[PDB]
Amino acid sequence: ENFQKVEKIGEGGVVYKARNKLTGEVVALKKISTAIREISLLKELNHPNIVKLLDVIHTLYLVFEFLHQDLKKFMDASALTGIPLPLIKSYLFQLLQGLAFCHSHRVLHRDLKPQNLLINTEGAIKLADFGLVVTLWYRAPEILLGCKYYSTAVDIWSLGCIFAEMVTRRALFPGDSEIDQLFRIFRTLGTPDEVVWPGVTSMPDYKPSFPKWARQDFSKVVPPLDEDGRSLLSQMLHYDPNKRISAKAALAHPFFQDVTKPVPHLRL
Ligand SMILES: O=c1cc(CN2CCOCC2)c2ccc(O)cc2o1
């Protein structure tokens, strides 16, 4: 009750912009036992590219650091011109730092998407809305194929899909059902098989009857991204999650040799 609601930000339960009546601080207020203990360990997961969880109030409200804009809105605003490459690269690099950190602490996001990447005036981008109409566009193929015990690699896939979208100004795999998501992936990357993804034919939802599409060449997928970027993107979208690049290894990729921190032009 220590909080006056200002504005509904979104329905992920519901998220409000709110003011704390004892601190003055403006926050994002998410109104939602084993879980109370999990969630409470997440208040300790602190990094400059993760949105801070300030407080967990069970009387379940989660009180987050407030950021004014998300990458989805910023991409819609940048649509006539495109986000400049040095800013794409800066955002990619920052998200990979955030992920490497989460992943080193065995925390997976599980549901990365432009809507939950938050940006500020200083050029920072932050991971929000961690997962403990549903959009499937960023889901890794092992999740779509019914794997119950998936890994940190699911987040690298999501982020590769976002990287592609920043570059092209179009969603990479805009599926509207699980099967359409999967076939859209297959149409671009090729239907996977045991040669490229050992064990694939044993995933819970794999069907031998899936149609067999041939792989497209990547130069068609994210023009006009340079070879460094396309190389990193291909490694993030590797089918086999054991071969997909880690966040740590991606930070050493040649694509980042000239990374900088530009500031974006934001209308709040
Ligand atoms: O957990 C959250 C989720 C949101 C917004 N969601 C993202 C997904 O879509 C619904 C809207 C959020 C917004 C601003 C903020 O500062 C912190 C935040 O923390």
Curated annotation (Swiss-Prot):
Please report the organism this UniProt entry assigns to the protein: Homo sapiens
> Example GO molecular function term?
protein domain specific binding
The UniProt subunit note reads as follows: Found in a complex with CABLES1, CCNA1 and CCNE1. Interacts with CABLES1. Interacts with UHRF2. Part of a complex consisting of UHRF2, CDK2 and CCNE1. Interacts with the Speedy/Ringo proteins SPDYA and SPDYC. Interaction with SPDYA promotes kinase activation via a conformation change that alleviates obstruction of the substrate-binding cleft by the T-loop. Found in a complex with both SPDYA and CDKN1B/KIP1. Binds to RB1 and CDK7.
Identify which residues the record assigns to the active site.
111
Where exactly is the site CDK7 binding? 8, 72-73, 136
> What does the PTM comment of the record read?
Nitrosylated after treatment with nitric oxide (DETA-NO).
Q: Which UniProt keywords apply?
A: Acetylation, ATP-binding, Cell cycle, Cell division, Cytoplasm, Cytoskeleton, DNA damage, DNA repair, Endosome, Kinase, Magnesium, Meiosis, Metal-binding, Mitosis, Nucleotide-binding, Nucleus, Phosphoprotein, S-nitrosylation, Serine/threonine-protein kinase, Transferase
- Tell me what reaction this enzyme catalyses: L-seryl-[protein] + ATP = O-phospho-L-seryl-[protein] + ADP + H(+); L-threonyl-[protein] + ATP = O-phospho-L-threonyl-[protein] + ADP + H(+)
Q: What does the similarity note say?
A: Belongs to the protein kinase superfamily. CMGC Ser/Thr protein kinase family. CDC2/CDKX subfamily.
Give the consequence of mutating residue 136 to R: Reduced phosphorylation by CAK and reduced kinase activity
Please state the Enzyme Commission number of this protein: 2.7.11.22
Amino-acid positions noted as binding Mg(2+) in the UniProt annotation, renumbered to this chain? 116, 129
A Gene Ontology CC term for this entry? male germ cell nucleus
Function, in words: Serine/threonine-protein kinase involved in the control of the cell cycle; essential for meiosis, but dispensable for mitosis. Phosphorylates CABLES1, CTNNB1, CDK2AP2, ERCC6, NBN, USP37, p53/TP53, NPM1, CDK7, RB1, BRCA2, MYC, NPAT, EZH2. Triggers duplication of centrosomes and DNA.
Cofactor dependence is on: Mg(2+)
Q: Which residues form the Protein kinase domain?
A: 3-256
Q: Under what conditions is it induced?
A: Induced transiently by TGFB1 at an early phase of TGFB1-mediated apoptosis.
- Which PANTHER family does this chain map to? CELL DIVISION PROTEIN KINASE, CYCLIN-DEPENDENT KINASE 2
Where does the UniProt annotation locate this protein?
Cytoplasm, Cytoskeleton, Microtubule organizing center, Centrosome; Nucleus, Cajal body; Cytoplasm; Endosome
| Residue positions, PTM N6-acetyllysine | 5
Q: Return the protein name.
A: Cyclin-dependent kinase 2
Keyword set includes Methyltransferase: no
InterPro entries, alphabetically? CDK (IPR050108), Kinase-like_dom_sf (IPR011009), Prot_kinase_dom (IPR000719), Protein_kinase_ATP_BS (IPR017441), Ser/Thr_kinase_AS (IPR008271)
- Where does the record place the modification Phosphotyrosine? 16
Q: Which Pfam families match?
A: Pkinase
Annotated cofactor note: Binds 2 Mg(2+) ions.
